[PDB]
A paper describes a structure:
The basic helix–loop–helix ([name]) family of transcription factors recognizes DNA motifs known as E-boxes (CANNTG) and includes 108 members. We focused on two structurally and evolutionarily distinct [name] members from the [name]-LZ and [name]-PAS clades, represented by the proliferation regulator MYC-MAX and the circadian TF [name]-[name], respectively. Structural studies with engineered or native nucleosome sequences show that MYC-MAX or [name]-[name] triggers the release of DNA from histones to gain access.
The 3.8-Å structure of the endogenous Por sequence (NCPPor) accommodates two [name]-[name] protomers engaging the nucleosomal ends from SHL+5.0 to SHL+6.5 in line with end-binding behaviour. The two [name] DNA-binding domains are angled around 40° from one another. The more internal [name]-[name] molecule (E-box 1) (local resolution 4–8 Å) superimposes well with the [name]-[name] structure at SHL+5.8 in the W601 backbone. Consistent with its binding preferences in SeEN-seq, [name]-[name] enforces a solvent-exposed register of E-box 1 in the Por backbone. We observe that the two [name]-[name] protomers engage in extensive interactions with one another and the histone core, mediated by the PAS domains. [name] at E-box 1 forms well-defined interactions with the histone core, with the HI loop of the [name] PAS-B contacting the H3α1 L1 elbow, sterically occluding the acidic patch. The [name] face of the internal heterodimer (E-box 1) mediates interactions with the external heterodimer (E-box 2). The F-α PAS-A helix of [name] (residues 206–213) is central to tandem PAS–PAS interactions between [name]-[name] protomers. On the basis of XL-MS and map interpretation, we provide a tentative model for E-box 2 with the PAS domains residing on top of but not interacting with the histone core. The Por structure, with its tandem arrangement, thus identifies cooperative protein–protein interactions between two [name]-[name] protomers as a further strategy to engage chromatinized E-boxes.
Residue numbers in the entry:
A (entry chain P): 80 to 129
B (entry chain M): 34 to 91, 105 to 223, 248 to 384
C (entry chain O): 35 to 91
D (entry chain E), I (entry chain A): 40 to 130
E (entry chain C), K (entry chain G): 16 to 118
F (entry chain F), J (entry chain B): 22 to 102
G (entry chain N): 75 to 129, 150 to 218, 245 to 263, 282 to 296, 316 to 447
H (entry chain D): 34 to 124
DNA sequence: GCACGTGGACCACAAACGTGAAGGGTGAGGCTGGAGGAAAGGCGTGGCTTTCAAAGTCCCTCTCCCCTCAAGGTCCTGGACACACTACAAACCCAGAGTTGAAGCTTGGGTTGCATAACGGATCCAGGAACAAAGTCGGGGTGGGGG
DNA sequence: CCCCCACCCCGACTTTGTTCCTGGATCCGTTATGCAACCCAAGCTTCAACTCTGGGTTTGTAGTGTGTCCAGGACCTTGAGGGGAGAGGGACTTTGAAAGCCACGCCTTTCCTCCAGCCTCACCCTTCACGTTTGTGGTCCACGTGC
């Protein structure tokens, strides 16, 4: 059971990575940046864009 | 530029450390060069200790003090009850033409007229007081005193008859590890123009060029900081417009000697700054020639500021 | 060392959470207790709709 | 007239065989004294010095013209241009 | 005579004196001026021979600066040694480039 | 005086260039030649005048011209020395 | 082996060096309250910053303040606004600190002195080059006497450049005359004149002695102020001094002043000659109060 | 004052007895002789200095000659100076 | 592939920016000894002397190349030809 | 010792030409350059060896190279003088 | 030291000894060494000034041969005085002829 | 060697800078080169005038001949000032 | 699901490290400077007379000026190929190391040497007279172009 | 290929310069003394030579594409060639006196000598600057697991 829960946690962290990249796609600055950004930087840019 | 960039950053770390070491060492007392960085830190350690101890057991006031002393036409003076002088401010030389070394350790009554000695002796000797452990002497009304007297002037030629100035002492009696009196001495006759007697820098200089009519053809960037006039304010004007009355004749003699020899060194003289101070100078001169016939074209003048002690010595 | 890694990790998670909360706070029809992924999805939709509606105003 | 170039070749032969000065003397003297006055006035000049200057100048100029001719030839030209002189001097 | 000892025309005494003048050195070995005079005489002979040959080619019996110019500029070794000398009334070699000739 | 540089006439320059084997000449050459010659003369004259001045004389001698040319790297025989 | 050995002693002397330096950095830190209060090993760089940040006078302050006279003021060069003034100004101008601070000196100045003060406020331990000194008329709260003549002396100082100066209201009368027993220096003023006697240079002592400010004398003739009873004698001295280099001293004579009265003066005159041109530059005079 | 006209003329009579020399050519030759003398003397002086020697000997001259003269001329001049010094030393 | 000449411009900038020796030192040293043996065998050299020789050679060649480039430009040409070197050397 | 003239590589010549601002090179240059260099260097070597010989030494010193360059109008700084 | 009496940095005594050696003349006037030392010091100052400017323009604190080359080739008068001089690791000015530029 | 004086001069011109040993050797070479030029030219001038002594006149002339006019003016001024200060004291 | 943990990633600091560059100190003696004197170089005065400046005049070559017309410079166009640019392979150059001793360099000994000076002497230099060469003008022969 | 025209070199006549002869000297040369610059023999240690091993950046060789060099046609305008006219140059002649040269007398400048003593140079010790690695830790993250 714990493996299934941990892999649901992986599904969650994957969903979050995917939505962080999608949110980045809606932020011009993030959409323009080259390096694989660290999560906090993406979210800071997102709250700055809104 | 990858590793050039990392090396730039590391050399910058190096630089920042060096800058901080230099700043740290610059503020110390008894400053000197050739100290190793460890010695710089050790002297900073010692200085922090000493300064913290002395302060704990205790616009700038220096600029205010200078400004007020000058405006009042005055100087600090301190003397023992026996009449012996113990300290004096340098401004005394500009006001009375005595050097501090001519005053210190000497009797004040050598400069006060003999017909007034009894009065100042009474002033100094009649007052006696012992302070408590709580109140500084200068703050007690009993120690404050205001009085007036005449004082002798110095001179460049001892043949001049004795000349004096009336002054007011404003000061207080203070004890020293004997009892002295220390006062701001103000001249009763105001002195709206005065001579600078000590050079505020170890050496300072400025250069110019002059025509065969002695009119300014050039003034360097160092003059305005010294004399207060910008180049355009002097160009075309005669150098004589800025020299002191008594020195006009000696400077004419110097320029005649220069016309005689083409090069040389001048006598001492005074120059009136835009700030209304006569500054003592000495100048080196030489002349340049028009190749077509080897006759003069312009004079070059290198002016050096000098002290009243060197003036009075020769 | 481990205490400092714990501190920096909690700081990382706290910064992330503060940013998630600020991001979600600007949304229309706001409601608390939304899952992080739901916060981001609603933020994605809100950015799309707000940008389009404002641009075409 | 003869076709241009032929008479020039005859002139070239003449002046290469010859040795006399090709410049006018008195204009040269006046030009010298005109220049010299700028360095110093009231100057006096030996005719030997004048002749030395004339010879040196013609020699220098002819050498420079030879180099200029080489440059023009290199540029596939018969006619020399100021650029040829500038280049030769620079080299 | 030193020149006679060496079998030379040029004056050894003058050369020696000139070497003691000019501050060329503090001391001068006796053989030094001899060697120098021999070299000078040899070079002089080369030049004069070539110049006389030029004069003869020009059907002349007395050397003039024109002859010296032609001779020195024709001899490659002397030309290299004296390339930057100018000769009064020397003229120039009769050189014309083929490209300039009519065709 | 002045303007004696124009005294270096176009035919004189033609003769000189022809001695250099020059078959054809552009008009621009003449002024350029005058300028170059002026520079050359000015340098030589400056040096010769300097020699004369150091000797404290007023008369220019060919020996000064030769010394000037010598130090300029150009040697002229047949004017003494 | 010998090369490696020579490198050991040297490299460990360098170790001794960095050990000494780190020891002294830590000691210096101990002497800085903030560094000593900080728990963590502060890096040598931050430690040095904090150290440089971390790195009688009142007797003198009273000794000079008790002797003070006039009033101190600070006026912005770019501003003309009085940035500060001492309370003693209320004795002098009768305006208070609050009436002066935050307001511009130039309305308190007389209209013809505003230009002069502006020229003085132009830029070019207080050094003689930055020094400035001028007489001017300043308004008073109670009034022709709506203005009083103030001597202002100071220096220029720096973000907003400003003149720091003392303004003193000197008595134009001469109190406490010299005692006959004592040779005392009388008041004096120097002036220089064109051939016809018109002022071409004058000093501030002339303003203290004559009440006329410098611009009020420059461009005017001395004969406009000489008293007619002495103009004959003074004109004789003038005619003579034009012919000789010798210094001629006049008799005592009367000279008119701004308020309309006359004062007694005695003057030493000479015609100075420039040696380069062999020409008289101008008449030079030292006037003396009798 | 001194010139080499005597020796120039005698040498001319050695190489071309039938031939004379003009004073202009003679001046050229004297200038040449003096120029070569200066070249050799200066080079030999430098050589002696470079070797901290106070004396100039035939070695310094031979070296200066080798440095100054082109190859063919150098060989002949060296042989000539050698012969001259040899005979002079023998005599 | 970049276009002919573009890399050459980057190279020009690089080599003008740099200061290092461009010839390989050992080939140069052996070439020196290959020449020197002709004048004297069994001859040694201070390495510094060899370096001085190389630097002088590179400087001399670089100057000659620049002059040659000017010649080619005068001919309105980019590629330098032996004619250009020969003309420069003749001048 | 043989063929060391080939030791002067075509890339070395190219680099020197680039330092000389040269953009394009004809192949004939490589051999032409080798010849010119051989001449120049041989003359310098002859002079330096002549200095060494006069000094009666068996080792060439940089000072001899300096003198050889100096007298050929190639004054060089960096190796004493 | 005469240099101190002249306010000069250079060793006037050494300069006088060097002029007294080298056989430049029979005698040396006492003012000549001072004059020469002044000239040398002045030229040195000019060169070092230009060199330090070049170094700072490239953010360097140490003068290297490249800086000397740059200064000397940039300064026209020094380029005249030192036109034929060569410097170790000197390099060249970044000169590019316009015709070579691509477009 | 002149390294001491070269260094001191730099400390008067750019106190915040140092010198590579190669640059210092270059300066020594340059000093000796210029010294040789001037001394030789002055020697010639003395000879051209059959003089036995080299003075500041000869050096001034050699400087005017050797240096371009700008540098010549400044260098002549420096020599003049140096000789003036020295002779005057 | 979130927070913390650990591994991992990444950043940047922070320090020592040793190496390379530089500077400070002490030894130390060479070299600078000063005193003292001798006598040589130079300044100074007084005179002359050689050379260039400056000009006049006539004859004349050379320069000024104008036009024509073909040839040379130039512009524009097209071809191809010698050169540059990429690539892989190789090598010898570079770096670092070791090993050997010929030559560099210093010391001491002794000599042969060249400078210097006095003195001898005769070939050279200034000058006087005669002959040949140089300058100027005219004629003849050779070289190239045009028909 | 032949004829005509122009240029280049030679020949003749007149004036000036050079060579040969004459007298006086001092430049050249000899013989002598002197102090010492330099050669020579010898020993001691160094730097250069010579060699090797290992690494790898540079060099060499090869393949392909095109920018550059060159040839070519064709215009059109610039220089050349000549004619013809006019002017300052050139040559030769003249005079004026200024400047350079010379000789005479004085003196003071610097070489030469010896000494004193300290600044510049060498070595030795020590320190700092630097890159640069590394240590070291922190920030932070990716996603595990635990709670």
């Amino acid at each position: 059971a714990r493996e299934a829960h941990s892999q649901i946690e992986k599904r969650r962290r994957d969903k979050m990575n995917s939505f962080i990249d999608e949110l980045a796609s809606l932020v011009p600055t993030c959409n323009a940046m080259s390096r694989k950004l660290d999560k906090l930087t993406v979210l800071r840019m997102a709250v700055q864009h809104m | 530029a990858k590793r050039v960039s990392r090396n730039k950053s590391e050399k910058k770390r190096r630089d920042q450390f060096n800058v901080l070491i230099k700043e740290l060492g610059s503020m110390l007392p008894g400053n000197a060069r050739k100290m190793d960085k460890s010695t710089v830190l050790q002297k900073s350690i010692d200085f922090l200790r000493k300064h913290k101890e002395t302060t704990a057991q205790s616009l700038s006031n220096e600029e205010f003090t200078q400004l007020m002393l000058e405006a009042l036409d005055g100087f600090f003076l301190a003397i023992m009850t026996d009449g012996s002088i113990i300290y004096v401010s340098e401004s005394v030389t500009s006001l009375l033409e005595h050097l501090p070394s001519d005053l210190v350790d000497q009797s004040i009554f050598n400069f006060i007229p003999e017909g007034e000695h009894s009065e100042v002796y009474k002033i100094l000797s009649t007052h006696l007081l012992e302070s408590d452990s709580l109140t500084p002497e200068y703050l007690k009304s009993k120690n404050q005193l205001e009085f007036c007297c005449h004082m002798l002037r110095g001179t460049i030629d001892p043949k001049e008859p004795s000349t004096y100035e009336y002054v007011r002492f404003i000061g207080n009696f203070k004890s020293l590890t004997r009892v002295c009196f220390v006062a701001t001495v103000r001249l009763a006759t105001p002195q709206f123009i005065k001579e600078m007697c000590t050079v505020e820098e170890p050496n300072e200089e400025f250069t110019s060029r002059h025509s065969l009519e002695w009119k300014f053809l050039f003034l360097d960037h160092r003059a305005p900081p010294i004399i207060g006039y910008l180049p355009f304010e002097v160009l075309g004007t005669s150098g004589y417009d800025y020299y002191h009355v008594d020195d006009l004749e000696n400077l004419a003699k110097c320029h005649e000697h220069l016309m005689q020899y083409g090069k040389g060194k001048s006598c001492y003289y005074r120059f009136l700054t835009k700030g209304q101070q006569w500054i003592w100078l000495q100048t080196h001169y030489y002349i340049t020639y028009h190749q077509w016939n080897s006759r003069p074209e312009f004079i070059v003048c290198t002016h050096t500021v000098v002290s009243y002690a060197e003036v009075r010595a020769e | 060392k481990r205490v400092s890694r714990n501190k920096s990790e909690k700081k990382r998670r706290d910064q992330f959470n503060v940013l998630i909360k600020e991001l979600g706070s600007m949304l229309p029809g706001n409601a608390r207790k939304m899952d992080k992924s739901t916060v981001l999805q609603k933020s994605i939709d809100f950015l799309r709709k707000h940008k389009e509606t404002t641009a075409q105003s | 007239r003869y076709r241009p170039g032929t008479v020039a070749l005859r002139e070239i032969r003449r002046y290469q065989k010859s040795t006399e000065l090709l410049i006018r003397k008195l204009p040269f003297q006046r030009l010298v004294r005109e220049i010299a006055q700028d360095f110093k006035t009231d100057l006096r000049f030996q005719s030997s010095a004048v002749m030395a200057l004339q010879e040196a100048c013609e020699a220098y100029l002819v050498g420079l013209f030879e180099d200029t001719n080489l440059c023009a030839i290199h540029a596939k030209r018969v006619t020399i241009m100021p650029k040829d002189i500038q280049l030769a001097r620079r080299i | 005579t030193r020149s006679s000892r060496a079998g030379l025309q040029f004056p050894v005494g003058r050369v020696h004196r000139l070497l003691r003048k000019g501050n060329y050195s503090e001391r001068v070995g006796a053989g030094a001026p001899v060697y120098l005079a021999a070299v000078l005489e040899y070079l002089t002979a080369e030049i004069l021979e070539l110049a006389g040959n030029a004069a003869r080619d020009n059907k002349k019996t007395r050397i003039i600066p024109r002859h010296l110019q032609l001779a020195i500029r024709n001899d490659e070794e002397l030309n290299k040694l004296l390339g930057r000398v100018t000769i009064a009334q020397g003229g120039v070699l009769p050189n014309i480039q083929a490209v300039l000739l009519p065709k | 005086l002045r303007d004696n540089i124009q005294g270096i006439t176009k035919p004189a320059i033609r003769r000189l260039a022809r001695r250099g084997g020059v078959k054809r000449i552009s008009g621009l050459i003449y002024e350029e030649t005058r300028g170059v010659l002026k520079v050359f003369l000015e340098n030589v004259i400056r040096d010769a005048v300097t020699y004369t001045e150091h000797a404290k004389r007023k008369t220019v001698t060919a020996m000064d011209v030769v010394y000037a040319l010598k130090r300029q790297g150009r040697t002229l025989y047949g004017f003494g020395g | 082996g010998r090369i490696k050995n020579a490198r050991e002693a040297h490299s460990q002397i360098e170790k001794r060096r960095r050990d000494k330096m780190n020891s002294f950095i830590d000691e210096l830190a101990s002497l800085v309250p903030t560094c000593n209060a900080m728990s963590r090993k502060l890096d040598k760089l931050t430690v040095l910053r904090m150290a440089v940040q971390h790195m009688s006078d009142d007797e003198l302050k009273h000794l000079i303040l008790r002797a003070a006279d006039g009033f101190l003021f600070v006026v912005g060069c770019d501003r003309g606004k009085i940035l500060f003034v001492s309370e003693s100004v209320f004795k002098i101008l009768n305006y208070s600190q609050n009436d002066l601070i935050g307001q511009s000196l130039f309305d308190y100045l007389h209209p013809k002195d505003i230009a002069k003060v502006k020229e003085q406020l132009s830029s070019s331990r207080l050094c003689s080059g930055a020094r400035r000194s001028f007489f001017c008329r300043m308004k008073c709260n109670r009034p022709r006497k709506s203005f009083c003549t103030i001597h202002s002396t100071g220096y220029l100082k720096s973000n907003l450049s400003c003149l720091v100066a003392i303004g003193r209201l000197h008595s134009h009368m001469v109190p406490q005359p010299a005692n006959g027993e004592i040779r005392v220096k009388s008041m004096e003023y120097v002036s220089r004149h064109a051939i016809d006697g018109k002022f071409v240079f004058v000093d501030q002592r002339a303003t203290a002695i004559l009440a006329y400010l410098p611009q009020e004398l420059l461009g005017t003739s001395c004969y406009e102020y000489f008293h007619q009873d002495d103009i004959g004698h003074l004109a004789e001295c003038h005619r003579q001094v034009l012919q000789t280099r010798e210094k001629i001293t006049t008799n005592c004579y009367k000279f008119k002043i701004k308020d309309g009265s006359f004062i007694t003066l005695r003057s030493r005159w000479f015609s100075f000659m420039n040696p380069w041109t062999k020409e008289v530059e101008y008449i030079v005079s030292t006037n003396t109060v009798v | 004052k001194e010139s080499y006209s005597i020796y120039v003329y005698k040498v001319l009579k050695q190489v071309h007895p039938d031939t004379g020399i003009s004073s202009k050519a003679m001046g050229i030759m004297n200038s040449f002789v003096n120029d070569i003398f200066e070249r050799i003397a200066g080079e030999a002086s430098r050589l002696a200095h470079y070797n901290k020697r106070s004396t100039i000997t035939s070695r310094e001259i031979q070296t200066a000659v080798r440095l100054l003269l082109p190859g063919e001329l150098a060989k002949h001049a060296v042989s000539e100076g050698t012969k001259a010094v040899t005979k002079y030393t023998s005599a």
